[PDB]
Each structure stands twice: as structure tokens, then as C-alpha cells.
Ligand binder design. Structure first.
Ligand code: HEM
Ligand code: HEM
Ligand SMILES: Cc1cc(N)nc(C[C@H]2CNC[C@H]2NCCNCCc2cccc(F)c2)c1
Ligand SMILES: Cc1cc(N)nc(C[C@H]2CNC[C@H]2NCCNCCc2cccc(F)c2)c1
Ligand SMILES: C[C@H](O)[C@H](O)[C@H]1CNc2nc(N)[nH]c(=O)c2N1
Ligand SMILES: C[C@H](O)[C@H](O)[C@H]1CNc2nc(N)[nH]c(=O)c2N1
Ligand SMILES: [Zn+2]
Lengths: 407, 411
């Protein structure tokens, strides 16, 4: 029932009671741990709705009140009638903030309550989506003073009238397969980039081409739109010490904005719910730039640094990795674009965990994702035991739309 | 039931069936994952089934399943259990068992080497002096003047739980730690408690930063006894840096032989409470964990100062910069002194090959991602990108309570 988590650096021990309220399954069993696997009706809806409303009314200290019982009856009647129901604005904002709060893979949750929620449930077309999204982009960017935001499009109905953003993130760089056999730009987006060209996009065919938005309203064919360049804040990447760094031709965008996930609140499913915060430096510097299957710039940078690249044991990869990540953080800070380093972000997360344990009885956290992809053990989260479990409201994965869509 | 694991860098997909053989529990449930939790007498009743399952495994491995030799062995063990409440492993079974415990060790990234283990049978040992002699021989053999060889020494099994053989040291070779009145620590802070016990037992401590601890050895449930490992047997490496001449002036050194001595080895239901085993180091164990953990030697600030890094803000990544330099130094020093060491790039690449092999020949490879991924530069190693499945197979190495917490003092 009660579970302890220990921090092996500080000896601080926390007691988790919040897991007892978990409703979805983890993928693990008593016999096998799947902790490192990336992807591990009318009748159905009323318990889900009831569970959520009870959470909500409890949160505002009105559990079992007249408003509470009356809301539960109103929702019951609407489900009995229409097969679905509608969230109040207050419930929608609560549900969104809590889906972020419950995101066990998110290191930046100390910020969970500050989310700006844009209600786009009145949207009907792809042009309308484009408009909402441009507005979200400009608001969240805030000329470099980034603010966290989510834009919420209409909920799933029969599932043949889905709102979807086909992009994985709102702002990403194109990837093209070449005659040469190699890849120009971002290789993760090769497939998406070719679907855009298939739909009519005139590709500039460069290394950092901001992809068009491809938007699907109400189950219809998706439509292409170019985001106004003045709305896409980009940072040229230079190094505080290495003059040649600027010459590598590197840049990245300021706004990380996940657009392919599903928001689940009280059994209602929001299949188009792009949300954005700001970067931790390592996402760009370690993952985007240095993954083998991404921009893979490690070979080139070590070359400019004149490191000994003959044997892995000179740690040439590791040395270059650090310089690159210094060059991401310096550039963003010099341009006054919000960014956090992995040391600061993980320190905040430990503080957040402590807050959540004392105020809420726990914090679901996925160690495999929380610990940064560089310098793991010099960050405090490495030494922190974490319990992973699934609470709702939640953000969930969903299949890529190009496999699902019926034209 | 067939489970798939994908490598997200290479798209290679593997299929696990071996998990079906797993008996024991992980600590996770359908509703909670405890994958990051560090630590999530036996009767005749329970013993024969454990023995049978082990001997079935063993006889399958040698292609003699269902043979007369197989059947006679099951009979002889069954008879021995009913007669004596326990049984004795044959030498061949003990070797197979110890190698498989290593093969099954899901937290170990060095398992490509599993079949080359040298097994020393010390089941005829009766005294702590006898333990000391066996351990010296293990250390000399494993050390091999810098050309390290994997080894394990196996002392007599648990009987009634009152006559346990134990090595009180967590590793055969480690450095003392001393808490000073001002609250600072001299030497290795991980070993403060153990060092205090040693001193209480009568060890005369030189009270320096790298004092090799004495062995504290318990035979047959008796009170443990102190022994000094002969210093000529303890290979040590002074740490210097290929480019930074001042690095040597930090006065750092480390020992060559990593030798875990506080784990329990389980084979066919038998429990070997003293089974010290050794391999050789991956650099990050020393350079990242031993030197840079805040609760260990904690040398980051001092190195960063000597490097004249900007230490006023974390986002200069001064900690990360110093970290890499320290780890270059550890690898360079070991290689220069011709002492076996593996870097985290090479060890992780070898682990992926081993894992692919194991899935194909064995139907799986239990692996604990949290432990396998190195503590620096995670995602530039191929293991970061490899999905893994963690489950518990026997034979196995298990943790056991520290002996000072459980021992009954005879005085
Ligand atoms: C404000 C600053 C934020 C920071 C620094 C931050 C940081 C991160 C990081 C480092 C990850 C790991 C993702 C990866 O490695 O690809 C992550 C994942 C995640 N974040 Fe946060 N985040 C922030 C804001 C948000 C917001 C506003 C939301 C939702 C409203 C959110 C929801 C999530 C979710 C659902 C994941 C898991 C995504 C997945 O499984 O791929 N984050 N975040
Ligand atoms: C041959 C070279 C070897 C290498 C490079 C190696 C590497 C490692 C590493 C890096 C770890 C994680 C240790 C930590 O972070 O504390 C580990 C753990 C482990 N290794 Fe290996 N190892 C080797 C040999 C062996 C041998 C010979 C055995 C026993 C026969 C063994 C059994 C284990 C076990 C049981 C663990 C888990 C320890 C724990 O949970 O505390 N290893 N090894
Ligand atoms: C909101 C927010 C803020 C922030 N700093 N960072 C983020 C993650 C974004 C940006 N940088 C990486 C990207 N990550 C989001 C997408 N992750 C998918 C990983 C994946 C792939 C395939 C199968 C799976 F099961 C899972 C979001
Ligand atoms: C045999 C071998 C080879 C090798 N390269 N490396 C090793 C690990 C040794 C050496 N370098 C670290 C040390 N690690 C072994 C002891 N670690 C126990 C951690 C622990 C703490 C508390 C609760 C737990 F459940 C677990 C062994
Ligand atoms: C196989 C493994 O689960 C996968 O590589 C994970 C590991 N940890 C991660 N951690 C974060 N933050 N982001 C990721 O994409 C991943 N990938
Ligand atoms: C809390 C967490 O599980 C703990 O710090 C683990 C993380 N991974 C590790 N990995 C290895 N190899 N060794 C360790 O001691 C640890 N510590
Ligand atoms: Zn698990």
C-alpha cells in the first residue's frame, strides 16, 4: 500500500500513496519489467466521467456538495442522451493542467500549474486550425520569453471525424533522401517530408527547412500551410570560445511543440491538442544534433576540434558532446530565448517531486526518460528512486494519421 | 507468449521467449513500475523442486536430458535431500551454476565474457585463515600482473543459517573512509561505516586518502577476523592526464581489480553467502561514480578549478567538462600501465552484440536498462537506444543484508 522512494545521494526518503489512485496499466507484470519499452461506449463513459468530476470537485474543496451532485446528474443525463458530454471551461483547464502534472516522462513539471489553455473546440476547418495554431505559436514564443500553452481542438466523436495535426511537432526541419544515399536535413522527418511533397509542398531542399503544417479537420483530407517565418523564432548556434563553431552552419528553433499526442479528460478524447513549453538544452545538443539517426554532427565537430579520433577511449565523442551543448545554451541565452540546462532542470524536478510528495502523496516519474541523455549521474535525478504509474487526465500516444486515415 | 524489443537507432527487432522460464518476481505490477528502485534457512519441502529445475537445465545444456546419468543424479539428490535436508553440487554443476548466475545478471554490461569465468571451489574451507588464503590466490590469479582474468571463489553453502561464511567487505579491495570531527571525510565516504568496524576490530588505520582496507572474514558463523592483503598483491594505478600535467598533482590513484564480495550466489536452491567475484573495470565506474559522485571522492570542483572553468553558472557545463577530462585520465592511466580496462563506448557496443547473440541462441537476455546505460554520455552509447526486458532467472546473484546488521556475536 504505502511505498517508499529513497534518494541515494541525500538519504531523503519519500512515501508514495498517490499510486493507489492509478487506473491505467504500466506494461509491467510481477514477472517482467517493461520500463525501457518506448510504447509498452455509453456504458464505459459514466465511470470515467464520475472519476474525473470527483477529482475536480475535491480539488476545489466541494466534494459531495450541491454543485458536485448536480454536475454529476447533468453529465449522466447528457451521456444517456447524446452518447457523449461537454466539459465546462473550468474542467477543461483543470484537465489539461493535470494531464501535464501526470506526465511521468516530463522533467519540466514544476511549471504544471502555469499553463495557458486555448479552447479551440469551436473550430471547424483546417484554415481555422491554422489560425488557432499561428496564434498559439505567437503567444507561446512571446519574442523569446517563452510561455507554456496548449490549444485544444474538438473531441473525438464516432472516430471518423477526428481533428489531427499530422506534424509530430509544430515546428520541425525537413528531411530528404538523396541520390548520394545519405540524408539532407533531419532524417527523422524523411517520411513526413515526402508526404508534404506528395501533397504539393515546394521543398527548398536545404538542411534547415521549416516544415509546413499539415492539418486535418473533421476527418477530411489534410491541408498544407506555411507558418509565417516571423512567427518561427530561430537561434543561430555559436560557441563562446570556438570562433569556428558559428561556421558549422547550425541553428535550431526556439519552440518545442508536441502536436501528435492525445489528451484524455474524463473519458473524452482530444486527438488534436498541440502543447508547448521551452527546451532543455540536451534535447537539441545531445539528441537532435548527436543521435546517429538524427543530424549526427559528432564526427564533424570533433574534426574541427582536432581530437584523436582513432580510438573510442580518447573520449573524443564525449568531449565534443560537451562543447556542442555549451554552444546550444550560450546561443539561446545570448539571444534571450528561454532555455534550461539539464543541471537546473533536474534540480527543479527534485524540488517538484518533494512538493508533490508532501502536497499530493506522490509524483509518477519515469526514470528512463527523466535522467538526461548526457552526464546522467552528475544530475540529482540519477540518484533518485522514482515510481512510474499512470494517472488520468493524461497525454497518450496515438497511431500516426497516415496509417489510420480513410480518404 | 512472445515479446518484442526494438532498437530505435537501427530498427532491429528481437523476440523474447526466455522470459517464460522466469520464476521469481521483479517488484513491478500491472499498475506500478519499480524499475528504478535499487532494492525492490530453507526446508526440504521447497528444495527438491529447485534442485530438479536446476539439474534439468544442467543436463539439457550438456545434451544429456533424460539420460540414465540425468535420472540417476535426480535420484541421488532426492535421496540426499530426504536424508540430510540439503545436497552437494558436483564440481561440474557448480561451474555451470556460477557461470549462469553471471549470464543471468541483468545489471551487468560485461556479460559477453560470461563463459570464460575461472571458478575456484573453496567448499572445503573451514576457517577465516583458510578464507584469507583462498582470497589471496583469487586476487593474484585475477590480477595476473595487469592482464586481468575473470574469477569467482565459492565458499561453503548456507546450512541452518547460523553457520554462514561471509566476506564482510563489500569489495575485496577498497579504500578506507574516515569521518573527521569537523564533519568532512578523509578517503572514500562510502566506506566510513565499514572502516569504523575494522578499527573497532583492532585495525590500526594509517588514516590517509587511499588506505587499502583489511579483509574481514567470517567462517562457519564465527566472529569475523582481520587480515591484511599483502600489498604486493594489490595492483594500483596512479592517475594522470595525457595533456594536463597538473592532473598527477591531485594525488589520485585507483586499484585495478573490481571484486564484489557481499552478494549471495543461488544454484539449485543452495545459497552460497560468500562468493567473491571479479572482472575488470569500465572506466566510468571509477571516473564518473567513484571520483565524481557527490557522496564519494567528489573531485569535480577541484578539477574544474585547476582547469580554470567558469563555475559561476551551471549552464557553462563546467561539471560536464571536468567529468570528461577525469574519465580520459582514468582510461589513459590504466592503458599506459597495461592494466585491463574498457571504455563505455566499447563495453556497450560489445553488450549489444552479446544481447543479439543471446536472443538468437537462448531466446532472450534479461537486461536492466537503468543499470546498463553508462552514467555519462548515455545516448551516444548504443544501449540508450535499445529496448530491454528485465526479469529474474536462476542461477542468480542476489543482495543480502550487511552482516554487521544480522551477525550473532559469540565474543
Ligand atoms: C515548460 C518547459 C518544459 C520542459 C523544460 C519540458 C521538458 C521535457 C523533456 C526534456 C521531455 C523528454 C522528451 C524527450 O526527451 O523527447 C519532456 C517530455 C514530455 N513533456 Fe515536458 N517540458 C516542458 C513543458 C511541457 C508542457 C507545457 C507539457 C504539456 C502541457 C509537457 C508534456 C510532456 C509530455 C506528455 C512528455 C512525454 C512525451 C513523450 O512521451 O514523447 N511538457 N518534457
Ligand atoms: C569482465 C568484466 C566485467 C565488466 C566490465 C563488468 C561491468 C559491470 C558494470 C559496469 C556493472 C554495473 C556496476 C555498478 O555500476 O555498480 C556490473 C554489475 C554487475 N556485474 Fe559485471 N562486470 C564484469 C564482470 C563480472 C563478473 C565476473 C561477474 C560475476 C561472475 C559480474 C557480475 C555482476 C553482477 C552480479 C552485477 C550487479 C551488481 C549490483 O547489483 O550491485 N560481473 N558489471
Ligand atoms: C512540450 C515539450 C517541451 C520540451 N522541452 N520538450 C518536448 C519534447 C519534444 C521536443 N524534443 C523532443 C520532442 N519529443 C516529443 C516526441 N517524443 C516521441 C518519442 C517516441 C518516438 C517513437 C515512439 C515512441 F513511443 C516515442 C516537449
Ligand atoms: C565484477 C565487477 C566488475 C566490474 N567492472 N564492476 C563491478 C561493480 C563494482 C565495481 N564498481 C562498482 C561496484 N558495484 C557493486 C556494488 N554495488 C551495489 C549498489 C547497491 C547499493 C544499494 C542497494 C542496492 F540494491 C545496490 C563488478
Ligand atoms: C529504448 C529506450 O526506452 C529509449 O531509447 C528512450 C530512453 N530514454 C529516453 N529519454 C528521453 N527523455 N527521451 C527519449 O526519447 C528516450 N528514449
Ligand atoms: C535510483 C537509481 O535506480 C540508482 O541511482 C541506480 C541508477 N543506475 C545505476 N547504474 C549502475 N550501473 N550503478 C548504479 O549504482 C546505479 N544506480
Ligand atoms: Zn517495471
Amino acid at each position: 500500500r504505502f511505498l517508499k522512494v529513497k534518494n541515494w545521494e541525500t538519504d531523503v526518503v519519500l512515501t508514495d500513496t498517490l499510486h493507489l489512485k492509478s487506473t491505467l496499466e504500466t506494461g509491467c507484470t510481477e514477472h517482467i519489467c517493461m520500463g525501457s519499452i518506448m510504447l509498452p461506449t455509453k456504458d464505459q463513459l459514466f465511470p470515467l466521467a464520475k472519476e474525473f468530476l470527483d477529482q475536480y470537485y475535491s480539488s476545489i474543496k466541494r466534494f459531495g456538495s450541491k454543485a458536485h451532485m448536480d454536475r454529476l446528474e447533468e453529465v449522466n443525463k447528457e451521456i444517456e442522451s447524446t452518447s457523449t458530454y461537454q466539459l465546462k471551461d473550468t474542467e477543461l483547464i483543470y484537465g489539461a493542467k493535470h494531464a501535464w502534472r501526470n506526465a511521468s516522462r516530463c522533467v519540466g513539471r514544476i511549471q504544471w500549474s502555469k499553463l495557458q489553455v486555448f479552447d479551440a473546440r469551436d473550430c471547424t476547418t483546417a484554415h481555422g486550425m491554422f489560425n488557432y495554431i499561428c496564434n498559439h505559436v505567437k503567444y507561446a514564443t512571446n519574442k523569446g520569453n517563452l510561455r507554456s500553452a496548449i490549444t485544444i481542438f474538438p473531441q473525438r466523436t464516432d472516430g471518423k471525424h477526428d481533428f489531427r495535426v499530422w506534424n509530430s511537432q509544430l515546428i520541425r526541419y525537413a528531411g530528404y533522401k538523396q541520390p548520394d544515399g545519405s540524408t539532407l536535413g533531419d532524417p527523422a522527418n524523411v517520411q513526413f517530408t515526402e508526404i508534404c511533397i506528395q501533397q504539393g509542398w515546394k521543398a527548398p531542399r536545404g538542411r534547415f527547412d521549416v516544415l509546413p503544417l499539415l492539418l486535418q479537420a473533421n476527418g477530411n483530407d489534410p491541408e498544407l500551410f506555411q507558418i509565417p517565418p516571423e512567427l518561427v523564432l530561430e537561434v543561430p548556434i555559436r560557441h563562446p570560445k570556438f570562433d569556428w563553431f558559428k561556421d558549422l552552419g547550425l541553428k535550431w528553433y526556439g519552440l518545442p511543440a508536441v502536436s501528435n499526442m492525445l489528451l484524455e479528460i474524463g473519458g473524452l478524447e482530444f486527438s488534436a491538442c498541440p502543447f508547448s513549453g521551452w527546451y532543455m538544452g540536451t534535447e537539441i545538443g545531445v539528441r537532435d544534433y548527436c543521435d546517429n539517426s538524427r543530424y549526427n554532427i559528432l564526427e564533424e565537430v570533433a574534426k574541427k576540434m582536432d581530437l584523436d579520433m582513432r580510438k573510442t577511449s580518447s573520449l573524443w565523442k564525449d568531449q565534443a558532446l560537451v562543447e556542442i551543448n555549451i554552444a546550444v545554451l550560450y546561443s539561446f541565452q545570448s539571444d534571450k530565448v528561454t532555455i534550461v540546462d539539464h543541471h537546473s532542470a533536474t534540480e527543479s524536478f527534485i524540488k517538484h517531486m518533494e512538493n508533490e510528495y508532501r502536497c499530493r502523496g506522490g509524483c509518477p516519474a519515469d526514470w528512463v526518460w527523466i535522467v538526461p541523455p548526457m552526464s546522467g549521474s552528475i544530475t540529482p535525478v540519477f540518484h533518485q528512486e522514482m515510481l512510474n504509474y499512470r494517472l488520468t487526465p493524461s497525454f497518450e500516444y496515438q497511431p500516426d494519421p497516415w496509417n489510420t486515415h480513410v480518404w
